[PDB]
Design a protein around this ligand. Structure first.
Ligand SMILES: *[C@@H]1O[C@H](CO)[C@@H](O[C@@H]2O[C@H](CO)[C@@H](O[C@H]3O[C@H](CO[C@H]4O[C@H](CO)[C@@H](O)[C@H](O)[C@@H]4O)[C@@H](O)[C@H](O[C@H]4O[C@H](CO)[C@@H](O)[C@H](O)[C@@H]4O[C@H]4O[C@H](CO)[C@@H](O)[C@H](O)[C@@H]4O)[C@@H]3O)[C@H](O)[C@H]2NC(C)=O)[C@H](O)[C@H]1NC(C)=O
Ligand SMILES: *[C@@H]1O[C@H](CO)[C@@H](O[C@@H]2O[C@H](CO)[C@@H](O[C@@H]3O[C@H](CO)[C@@H](O)[C@H](O[C@H]4O[C@H](CO)[C@@H](O)[C@H](O)[C@@H]4O)[C@@H]3O)[C@H](O)[C@H]2NC(C)=O)[C@H](O)[C@H]1NC(C)=O
Ligand SMILES: *[C@@H]1O[C@H](CO)[C@@H](O[C@@H]2O[C@H](CO)[C@@H](O)[C@H](O)[C@H]2NC(C)=O)[C@H](O)[C@H]1NC(C)=O
Lengths: 55, 174
């Protein structure tokens, strides 16, 4: 589908790497590479859908 | 009424008694009067405040739960997410509905308890010196001025010093 000049598309994938684990990337091409990592945790954190004015 | 006092043998509540919940209203040679009974008033209030405090307490913060509105059709995994939440809500609504019902019935009934508790306390206080008229009032068979009435309320009424007079007034013919 044509999106802003392009008739192509990128598939997005995610990976978690534990301490002591290693991220290993073998690619022969078509790789949209990572520039680094997000620090991922878990807690009093969420998300909500709303159009309510924040005041 | 369960204890049968409020809307049972007492005809009406006193709209003009705004200094308490339960109380006394009287007539004697020195006129008429009215004053609240702070013991039974406070007792009902304490019980209700207690359960009120106990109902109205907070819960745990809840943080990142599941999605409950869906913009697209996903079938089986969405079906379940919807089913879980719906189940939950029905159960919580039920609990709430039932809670209020039980609590309210109990509040109705405990306040009726306090009414009869006060009445019986007085009936015992007065021994053989007065008779139950049926409507929540007593017929006192001796002269009982405002000071006398103020010994009945306040529980400082020695029946024995009136006993003699009362018995003579109770046991005549007509
Ligand atoms: C497989 O099948 C699909 C469907 O048949 C097909 O998809 C089609 O792909 C082509 C090209 O990839 C694409 O072409 C035009 O896309 C732009 C959108 O056209 C839409 O315009 C409206 C939205 O604004 C929309 O309502 C219409 O209904 C229409 O669909 C269109 O702007 C493009 O035109 C610019 O680009 C071409 C070069 O690609 C120039 O030649 C044009 O002159 C024009 O350029 C001008 O404008 C730009 C700025 O807009 C400017 O920078 C430039 O200098 C110049 O001034 C395209 O003509 C179709 O839209 C798309 N169709 C659908 C339905 O998606 C695939 O291509 C098929 N695959 C193969 C291999 O054939
Ligand atoms: C995973 O990572 C490894 C990291 O090394 C990577 O290994 C490389 O694989 C390529 C592909 O086999 C090797 O390149 C070959 O080397 C020689 C000369 O360069 C040739 O054998 C091959 O050329 C072929 O090209 C022709 C054109 O089609 C063919 O027709 C013909 O058969 C030729 O043989 C090819 O270039 C490369 O040597 C290794 N690297 C090392 C260090 O050994 C591997 O490819 C990665 N996996 C992927 C990308 O899927
Ligand atoms: C009833 O008992 C209470 C005991 O506290 C007495 O209450 C007093 O009432 C008088 C009015 O008659 C007030 O002037 C006092 O301030 C009250 N004292 C307190 C501590 O509340 C009361 O005197 C007793 N009843 C009678 C008829 O005397």
């Amino acid at each position: 589908p044509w999106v802003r000049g392009v008739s192509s598309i990128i598939s997005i994938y995610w990976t978690i790497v534990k301490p002591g684990d290693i991220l290993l990337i073998n690619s022969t091409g078509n790789l949209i590479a990572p520039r680094g990592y997000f620090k991922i945790q878990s807690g009093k954190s969420s998300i909500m859908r709303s159009d309510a004015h924040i005041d | 009424g369960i204890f049968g006092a409020i809307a049972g043998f007492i005809e009406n509540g006193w709209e003009g008694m705004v200094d308490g919940w339960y109380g006394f209203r009287h007539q004697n040679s020195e006129g008429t009067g009215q004053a609240a009974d702070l013991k039974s008033t406070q007792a009902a209030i304490n019980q209700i405040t207690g359960k009120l405090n106990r109902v109205i307490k907070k819960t745990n913060e809840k943080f990142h739960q599941i999605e409950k509105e869906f913009s697209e059709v996903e079938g089986r995994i969405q079906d379940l997410e919807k089913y879980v939440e719906d189940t939950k809500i029905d159960l919580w609504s039920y609990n709430a509905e039932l809670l209020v019902a039980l609590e309210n019935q109990h509040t109705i009934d405990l306040t009726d308890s306090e009414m009869s508790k006060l009445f019986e306390r007085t009936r015992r206080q007065l021994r053989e010196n007065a008779e139950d008229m049926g409507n929540g009032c007593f017929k006192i068979y001796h002269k009982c001025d405002n000071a006398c009435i103020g010994s009945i309320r306040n529980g400082t009424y020695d029946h024995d010093i009136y006993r003699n007079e009362a018995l003579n007034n109770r046991f005549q013919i007509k």
